[PDB]
Design an enzyme around this catalytic site. Sequence first.
Site, PDB file in Angstrom:
ATOM      1  N   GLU D  63       0.714  -1.183  -0.031  1.00  0.00           N
ATOM      2  CA  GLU D  63       0.042  -0.058   0.106  1.00  0.00           C
ATOM      3  C   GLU D  63       0.999   1.272   0.077  1.00  0.00           C
ATOM      4  OE1 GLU D  63      -4.069   1.836   0.420  1.00  0.00           O
ATOM      5  OE2 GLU D  63      -3.486  -0.236   0.159  1.00  0.00           O
ATOM      6  N   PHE D  90      -1.225 -14.440  -0.889  1.00  0.00           N
ATOM      7  CA  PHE D  90      -0.142 -14.913  -0.079  1.00  0.00           C
ATOM      8  C   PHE D  90       0.237 -16.270  -0.508  1.00  0.00           C
ATOM      9  CE2 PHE D  90      -0.817 -11.231   2.651  1.00  0.00           C
ATOM     10  CZ  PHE D  90      -2.318 -11.278   2.944  1.00  0.00           C
ATOM     11  N   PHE D  91       1.464 -16.500  -1.128  1.00  0.00           N
ATOM     12  CA  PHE D  91       1.977 -17.731  -1.494  1.00  0.00           C
ATOM     13  C   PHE D  91       2.741 -18.661  -0.726  1.00  0.00           C
ATOM     14  CE2 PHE D  91       1.970 -15.235  -5.812  1.00  0.00           C
ATOM     15  CZ  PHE D  91       0.443 -15.354  -5.892  1.00  0.00           C
ATOM     16  N   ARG D  92       3.626 -17.925   0.181  1.00  0.00           N
ATOM     17  CA  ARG D  92       4.695 -18.507   0.665  1.00  0.00           C
ATOM     18  C   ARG D  92       4.839 -17.622   2.328  1.00  0.00           C
ATOM     19  NH1 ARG D  92       8.538 -22.168   0.508  1.00  0.00           N
ATOM     20  NH2 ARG D  92       7.796 -22.423  -1.763  1.00  0.00           N
TER      21      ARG D  92
HETATM   22  C1  LIG Z   1     -10.703   6.697  -3.412  1.00  0.00           C
HETATM   23  C2  LIG Z   1     -11.926   8.021  -3.369  1.00  0.00           C
HETATM   24  C3  LIG Z   1     -11.111   9.143  -3.608  1.00  0.00           C
HETATM   25  C4  LIG Z   1     -12.816   7.749  -4.645  1.00  0.00           C
HETATM   26  O1  LIG Z   1     -13.866   8.886  -4.397  1.00  0.00           O
HETATM   27  P1  LIG Z   1     -15.195   8.270  -4.130  1.00  0.00           P
HETATM   28  O2  LIG Z   1     -15.673   6.653  -4.383  1.00  0.00           O
HETATM   29  O3  LIG Z   1     -16.020   8.828  -5.551  1.00  0.00           O
HETATM   30  O4  LIG Z   1     -15.926   8.717  -3.044  1.00  0.00           O
HETATM   31  P2  LIG Z   1     -16.408  10.104  -3.008  1.00  0.00           P
HETATM   32  O5  LIG Z   1     -15.333  10.869  -4.086  1.00  0.00           O
HETATM   33  O6  LIG Z   1     -17.857  10.533  -3.186  1.00  0.00           O
HETATM   34  O7  LIG Z   1     -16.032  10.836  -1.468  1.00  0.00           O
HETATM   35  C5  LIG Z   1     -15.767   9.864  -0.311  1.00  0.00           C
HETATM   36  C6  LIG Z   1     -14.587  10.787   0.406  1.00  0.00           C
HETATM   37  O8  LIG Z   1     -13.506  10.649  -0.174  1.00  0.00           O
HETATM   38  C7  LIG Z   1     -12.651  11.611   0.257  1.00  0.00           C
HETATM   39  N1  LIG Z   1     -12.273  12.491  -1.096  1.00  0.00           N
HETATM   40  C8  LIG Z   1     -12.638  12.273  -2.122  1.00  0.00           C
HETATM   41  N2  LIG Z   1     -11.979  13.038  -3.269  1.00  0.00           N
HETATM   42  C9  LIG Z   1     -10.920  13.955  -2.404  1.00  0.00           C
HETATM   43  C10 LIG Z   1     -10.042  14.714  -2.599  1.00  0.00           C
HETATM   44  N3  LIG Z   1      -9.884  15.071  -3.881  1.00  0.00           N
HETATM   45  N4  LIG Z   1      -9.147  15.037  -1.744  1.00  0.00           N
HETATM   46  C11 LIG Z   1      -9.194  14.620  -0.362  1.00  0.00           C
HETATM   47  N5  LIG Z   1     -10.306  13.764   0.080  1.00  0.00           N
HETATM   48  C12 LIG Z   1     -11.248  13.372  -1.004  1.00  0.00           C
HETATM   49  C13 LIG Z   1     -13.375  12.695   1.082  1.00  0.00           C
HETATM   50  O9  LIG Z   1     -13.008  12.207   2.452  1.00  0.00           O
HETATM   51  C14 LIG Z   1     -14.852  12.199   0.521  1.00  0.00           C
HETATM   52  O10 LIG Z   1     -15.850  12.564   1.659  1.00  0.00           O
HETATM   53  P3  LIG Z   1     -16.422  13.995   1.585  1.00  0.00           P
HETATM   54  O11 LIG Z   1     -16.874  14.177  -0.101  1.00  0.00           O
HETATM   55  O12 LIG Z   1     -17.594  13.841   2.413  1.00  0.00           O
HETATM   56  O13 LIG Z   1     -15.457  15.071   1.782  1.00  0.00           O
HETATM   57  C15 LIG Z   1     -12.519   7.881  -1.994  1.00  0.00           C
HETATM   58  O14 LIG Z   1     -13.393   6.731  -1.997  1.00  0.00           O
HETATM   59  C16 LIG Z   1     -11.554   7.759  -0.754  1.00  0.00           C
HETATM   60  O15 LIG Z   1     -11.053   8.715  -0.334  1.00  0.00           O
HETATM   61  N6  LIG Z   1     -11.345   6.684  -0.093  1.00  0.00           N
HETATM   62  C17 LIG Z   1     -10.341   6.410   1.092  1.00  0.00           C
HETATM   63  C18 LIG Z   1      -9.005   6.247   0.577  1.00  0.00           C
HETATM   64  C19 LIG Z   1      -8.184   5.773   1.724  1.00  0.00           C
HETATM   65  O16 LIG Z   1      -8.347   6.274   2.829  1.00  0.00           O
HETATM   66  N7  LIG Z   1      -6.911   5.095   1.513  1.00  0.00           N
HETATM   67  C20 LIG Z   1      -5.836   5.356   2.486  1.00  0.00           C
HETATM   68  C21 LIG Z   1      -5.419   6.520   2.839  1.00  0.00           C
HETATM   69  S1  LIG Z   1      -3.778   6.943   3.964  1.00  0.00           S
HETATM   70  C1  LIG Z   2      -1.854 -20.651   1.543  1.00  0.00           C
HETATM   71  C2  LIG Z   2      -1.072 -21.857   1.608  1.00  0.00           C
HETATM   72  C3  LIG Z   2      -1.114 -22.496   2.765  1.00  0.00           C
HETATM   73  C4  LIG Z   2      -1.542 -22.399   0.147  1.00  0.00           C
HETATM   74  O1  LIG Z   2      -0.682 -23.514  -0.197  1.00  0.00           O
HETATM   75  P1  LIG Z   2      -0.219 -23.885  -1.900  1.00  0.00           P
HETATM   76  O2  LIG Z   2      -0.338 -22.394  -2.853  1.00  0.00           O
HETATM   77  O3  LIG Z   2      -0.705 -25.038  -2.119  1.00  0.00           O
HETATM   78  O4  LIG Z   2       1.279 -23.842  -1.463  1.00  0.00           O
HETATM   79  P2  LIG Z   2       2.026 -25.073  -1.247  1.00  0.00           P
HETATM   80  O5  LIG Z   2       0.932 -25.736  -0.479  1.00  0.00           O
HETATM   81  O6  LIG Z   2       2.547 -25.375  -2.446  1.00  0.00           O
HETATM   82  O7  LIG Z   2       3.259 -24.578  -0.139  1.00  0.00           O
HETATM   83  C5  LIG Z   2       4.148 -23.414  -0.395  1.00  0.00           C
HETATM   84  C6  LIG Z   2       4.578 -23.103   1.221  1.00  0.00           C
HETATM   85  O8  LIG Z   2       3.352 -22.875   2.209  1.00  0.00           O
HETATM   86  C7  LIG Z   2       3.531 -23.550   3.446  1.00  0.00           C
HETATM   87  N1  LIG Z   2       2.523 -24.293   3.808  1.00  0.00           N
HETATM   88  C8  LIG Z   2       1.897 -25.048   2.725  1.00  0.00           C
HETATM   89  N2  LIG Z   2       1.081 -26.040   3.767  1.00  0.00           N
HETATM   90  C9  LIG Z   2       1.209 -25.655   4.774  1.00  0.00           C
HETATM   91  C10 LIG Z   2       0.853 -26.239   6.087  1.00  0.00           C
HETATM   92  N3  LIG Z   2      -0.246 -27.147   6.095  1.00  0.00           N
HETATM   93  N4  LIG Z   2       1.237 -26.223   7.162  1.00  0.00           N
HETATM   94  C11 LIG Z   2       2.103 -24.813   7.297  1.00  0.00           C
HETATM   95  N5  LIG Z   2       2.695 -24.454   6.124  1.00  0.00           N
HETATM   96  C12 LIG Z   2       2.287 -24.854   4.864  1.00  0.00           C
HETATM   97  C13 LIG Z   2       4.827 -24.017   3.511  1.00  0.00           C
HETATM   98  O9  LIG Z   2       5.690 -22.826   3.846  1.00  0.00           O
HETATM   99  C14 LIG Z   2       5.138 -24.300   2.072  1.00  0.00           C
HETATM  100  O10 LIG Z   2       6.248 -24.442   1.620  1.00  0.00           O
HETATM  101  P3  LIG Z   2       6.982 -25.775   1.592  1.00  0.00           P
HETATM  102  O11 LIG Z   2       6.053 -26.887   1.040  1.00  0.00           O
HETATM  103  O12 LIG Z   2       8.235 -25.626   0.883  1.00  0.00           O
HETATM  104  O13 LIG Z   2       7.048 -26.101   3.149  1.00  0.00           O
HETATM  105  C15 LIG Z   2       0.198 -21.313   1.204  1.00  0.00           C
HETATM  106  O14 LIG Z   2       0.467 -20.722  -0.066  1.00  0.00           O
HETATM  107  C16 LIG Z   2       0.784 -20.352   2.120  1.00  0.00           C
HETATM  108  O15 LIG Z   2       1.303 -20.573   3.291  1.00  0.00           O
HETATM  109  N6  LIG Z   2       0.726 -19.059   1.922  1.00  0.00           N
HETATM  110  C17 LIG Z   2       1.037 -17.775   2.804  1.00  0.00           C
HETATM  111  C18 LIG Z   2       0.116 -17.754   4.016  1.00  0.00           C
HETATM  112  C19 LIG Z   2       0.570 -16.294   4.720  1.00  0.00           C
HETATM  113  O16 LIG Z   2       1.914 -16.391   5.269  1.00  0.00           O
HETATM  114  N7  LIG Z   2      -0.461 -15.693   5.392  1.00  0.00           N
HETATM  115  C20 LIG Z   2      -0.138 -14.875   6.568  1.00  0.00           C
HETATM  116  C21 LIG Z   2       0.527 -15.644   7.938  1.00  0.00           C
HETATM  117  S1  LIG Z   2       0.576 -14.664   9.268  1.00  0.00           S
END
Ligand SMILES: CC(C)(COP(=O)(O)OP(=O)(O)OC[C@H]1O[C@@H](n2cnc3c(N)ncnc32)[C@H](O)[C@@H]1OP(=O)(O)O)[C@@H](O)C(=O)NCCC(=O)NCCS
Ligand SMILES: CC(C)(COP(=O)(O)OP(=O)(O)OC[C@H]1O[C@@H](n2cnc3c(N)ncnc32)[C@H](O)[C@@H]1OP(=O)(O)O)[C@@H](O)C(=O)NCCC(=O)NCCS
Lengths: 140, 141, 140, 141
Positions: D63, D90-92
């Site tokens: 982000e 999330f893959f690994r």
């Molecule tokens: C993405 C986004 C700009 C798209 O706008 P939208 O879906 O058309 O929604 P709207 O434009 O109707 O407005 C929603 C809110 O977005 C914000 N916003 C929209 N355009 C903005 C601009 N040009 N500058 C600042 N804030 C804005 C305002 O807070 C607004 O509320 P308000 O109109 O009551 O001031 C809006 O949905 C958004 O701001 N989302 C939040 C983004 C976010 O928080 N990500 C992490 C930030 S660190």
């Molecule tokens: C989602 C997930 C389990 C799906 O499995 P997949 O796409 O089929 O991937 P695989 O099963 O081929 O395994 C890849 C890795 O996932 C982890 N994993 C898979 N199955 C697991 C299980 N049952 N227990 C623990 N770890 C596992 C292992 O690290 C594995 O690597 P290894 O086989 O070399 O040990 C695996 O992609 C994953 O662990 N992703 C990460 C999830 C994550 O980290 N989210 C936040 C955690 S706080």
Amino acid sequence: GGNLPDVASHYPVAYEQTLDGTVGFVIDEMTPERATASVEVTDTLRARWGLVHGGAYCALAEMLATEATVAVVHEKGMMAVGQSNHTSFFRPVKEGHVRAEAVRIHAGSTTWFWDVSLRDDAGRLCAVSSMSIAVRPRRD
Amino acid sequence: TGGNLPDVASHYPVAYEQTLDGTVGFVIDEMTPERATASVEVTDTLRARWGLVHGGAYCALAEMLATEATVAVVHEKGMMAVGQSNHTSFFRPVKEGHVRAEAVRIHAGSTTWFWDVSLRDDAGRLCAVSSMSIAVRPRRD
Amino acid sequence: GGNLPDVASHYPVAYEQTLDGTVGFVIDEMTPERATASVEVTDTLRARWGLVHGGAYCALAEMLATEATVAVVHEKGMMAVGQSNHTSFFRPVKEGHVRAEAVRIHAGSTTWFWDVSLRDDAGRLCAVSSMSIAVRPRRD
Amino acid sequence: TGGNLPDVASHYPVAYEQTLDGTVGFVIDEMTPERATASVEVTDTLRARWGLVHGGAYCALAEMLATEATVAVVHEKGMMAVGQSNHTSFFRPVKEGHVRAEAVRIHAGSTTWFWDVSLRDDAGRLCAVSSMSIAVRPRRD
Ligand SMILES: CC(C)(COP(=O)(O)OP(=O)(O)OC[C@H]1O[C@@H](n2cnc3c(N)ncnc32)[C@H](O)[C@@H]1OP(=O)(O)O)[C@@H](O)C(=O)NCCC(=O)NCCS
Ligand SMILES: CC(C)(COP(=O)(O)OP(=O)(O)OC[C@H]1O[C@@H](n2cnc3c(N)ncnc32)[C@H](O)[C@@H]1OP(=O)(O)O)[C@@H](O)C(=O)NCCC(=O)NCCS
Ligand SMILES: CC(C)(COP(=O)(O)OP(=O)(O)OC[C@H]1O[C@@H](n2cnc3c(N)ncnc32)[C@H](O)[C@@H]1OP(=O)(O)O)[C@@H](O)C(=O)NCCC(=O)NCCS
Ligand SMILES: CC(C)(COP(=O)(O)OP(=O)(O)OC[C@H]1O[C@@H](n2cnc3c(N)ncnc32)[C@H](O)[C@@H]1OP(=O)(O)O)[C@@H](O)C(=O)NCCC(=O)NCCS
């Protein structure tokens, strides 16, 4: 047969009758790590507003990523089906073609993931799709 | 309208029966500014070669329903609405019957509306969901 | 102990030292189908621009959905970890609190899915998160 | 700047060391209009109670990197940039070492920029990815 991977002697739905055959998707290249597919734009690919339907990019990505997984895993006893498809749209397409390239980024035991890029005839990036494909043992 | 899509203009570039939606048979049932429903009869045209409803069919039904439910409200305000992100997750497959979609509006901002779409089978089970973010922009022409 | 589900006698990282304890996440209600958590906004939750960091909503949703899964599955021999977190931002938060509610929408053998809503002190919907949680047998 | 975040203003509401990013230790290495990198040393502050890097840590590093890489370009054009969608997969897991993030810009529209973020461990393995969509709007004040 849209050139989908020939992994089985019978399929439930013939290509021409599937969604894929109806809108005209065809696979060009397929390897374990990278696949491509394309489609001619026709009205069948469009929404009523004249641009390619958002769903069509989603479906193109869905078939390409899933079938590129099937191509590897079917012979190993596994089935592959889409589990998440997140498509984002950057630029519309009114006519021409849509060309998709899926690049494999993770191949895990249970999940494969593909980055799919969807391009117009000028090569411009029109949509992308993050395709997550579930891989599970085939059922009796 | 064709497909019961909202009728907000006197003419459209592509007639319902020729569009993706009319080819696969999507039909809108209910339509309000906060909630909309649509359904489709499963036939082969909705399926992948493996015999289940194609993942892209749920994506497309969600895409059309959320976008059009937006269009229904914004078009007469001089805005266009088009999908910007469609995130569909698949929980259970559908082999036959219908797919029934309900879109619930959860955010209506000035530039983006967001709808949660649930896609259910004939038994009522939740088979897929889609998070639909719809860009809203002033019409160009 | 942020009130996270007490499912094990030892954890690798104490609450106060985890990311969760550092920013101050606390679970209020937890049931198999629905959980809530909240946090006071402090600078620790903010980006340099003064609004709550996008990552903080993501992390709140991540812990709540994952731990609400852990609460059910740990005793059954399973581990739960986030596999996809899709957070969308609707309205920023400058100060006050962020309150999250996760509603379970699917509980499958290998995947659970939670809709998380993130609200400000006025009850306004500021962000949402679609949380996909992988459930796998615990490793020896 | 604090965290080597892009320095595009003379003052900021919250100093680096007090923000989320400075608390968990995110640091920007490279920054260009199309590509940016950042990293973080894993310590407990980055972990969930179960001992791995917390899923929200990858989300937050993505982000900040994608948003700030946008800010670096648009701020002096009078625009603000804020995350609008963050989809992290999330893959690994990562137990210790560092997490290294590279953001590659793939679309720079007038209202939305999109970055693909890869998050790697010290062995170079791809442990998570994030699709970061960043809203760009004119600054209000
Ligand atoms: C993405 C986004 C700009 C798209 O706008 P939208 O879906 O058309 O929604 P709207 O434009 O109707 O407005 C929603 C809110 O977005 C914000 N916003 C929209 N355009 C903005 C601009 N040009 N500058 C600042 N804030 C804005 C305002 O807070 C607004 O509320 P308000 O109109 O009551 O001031 C809006 O949905 C958004 O701001 N989302 C939040 C983004 C976010 O928080 N990500 C992490 C930030 S660190
Ligand atoms: C989602 C997930 C389990 C799906 O499995 P997949 O796409 O089929 O991937 P695989 O099963 O081929 O395994 C890849 C890795 O996932 C982890 N994993 C898979 N199955 C697991 C299980 N049952 N227990 C623990 N770890 C596992 C292992 O690290 C594995 O690597 P290894 O086989 O070399 O040990 C695996 O992609 C994953 O662990 N992703 C990460 C999830 C994550 O980290 N989210 C936040 C955690 S706080
Ligand atoms: C992705 C998926 C396999 C993940 O499994 P999960 O979330 O752990 O769900 P479960 O494993 O609890 O099973 C739910 C249903 O999935 C299907 N399924 C699960 N594993 C399966 C397998 N190995 N083979 C065939 N179908 C399977 C079954 O229909 C199952 O229902 P049942 O157990 O009552 O027969 C499952 O959610 C799914 O099938 N989703 C639909 C995928 C889809 O339809 N995409 C497009 C197809 S063209
Ligand atoms: C969603 C979207 C409007 C957001 O805009 P953005 O990310 O800021 O991108 P930009 O606004 O820089 O412009 C990209 C293209 O979007 C289209 N667009 C943007 N605003 C538009 C508007 N108000 N009216 C019509 N088309 C518009 C144009 O084709 C534009 O190209 P151009 O500026 O060369 O004419 C834009 O990315 C988009 O149109 N994506 C495609 C949507 C889609 O095709 N979904 C399915 C349609 S059936």
